[PDB]
Amino acid sequence: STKPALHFLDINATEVKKYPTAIQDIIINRSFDGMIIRGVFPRDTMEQVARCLEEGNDGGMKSILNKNEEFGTKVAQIYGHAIVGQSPDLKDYFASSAIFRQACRTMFQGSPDFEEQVESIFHSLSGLPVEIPTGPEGQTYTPATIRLLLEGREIAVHVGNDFLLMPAANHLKTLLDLSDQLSYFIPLTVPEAGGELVVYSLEWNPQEASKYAQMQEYMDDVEFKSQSVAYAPGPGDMLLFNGGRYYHRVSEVIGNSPRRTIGGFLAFSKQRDKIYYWS
Ligand X SMILES: O=C(O)CCC(=O)C(=O)O
Binding residues (CB under 5 A) for Ni ion: these are 243
Tell me if 261 is assigned to a ligand binding site: yes
Determine, following the binding rule CB under 6 A, whether residue 41 of this chain makes contact with ligand X: no
End-to-end CA distance of the chain: 38
Determine, following the binding rule CB under 6 A, whether residue 250 of this chain makes contact with ligand X: yes
Give the x-and-dash track for 141-180 against ligand X (CB under 6 A): ------x-------x----x--------------------
Determine, following the binding rule CB under 6 A, whether residue 243 of this chain makes contact with ligand X: yes
Determine, following the binding rule CB under 6 A, whether residue 263 of this chain makes contact with ligand X: yes
Determine, following the binding rule CB under 6 A, whether residue 81 of this chain makes contact with ligand X: no
Determine, following the binding rule CB under 6 A, whether residue 235 of this chain makes contact with ligand X: no
Determine, following the binding rule CB under 6 A, whether residue 261 of this chain makes contact with ligand X: yes
In whole angstroms, give the CA distance from residue 57 to residue 52.
5
Tell me if 248 is assigned to a ligand binding site: yes
Count, residues in the chain: 279
Closest by CA position to 159, among listed 209, 122, 195, 194: 209
Nearest approach, Cβ of 235 to Ni ion (angstroms)? 20
Annotated binding site: 147, 158, 183, 192, 196, 228, 248, 256, 259, 261
Annotated binding site for 2-oxoglutarate: 147, 183, 259, 261
Annotated binding site for Ca(2+): 192, 196, 228, 256
Residues binding ligand X (CB under 6 A): 147, 155, 160, 183, 185, 197, 243, 248, 250, 261, 263
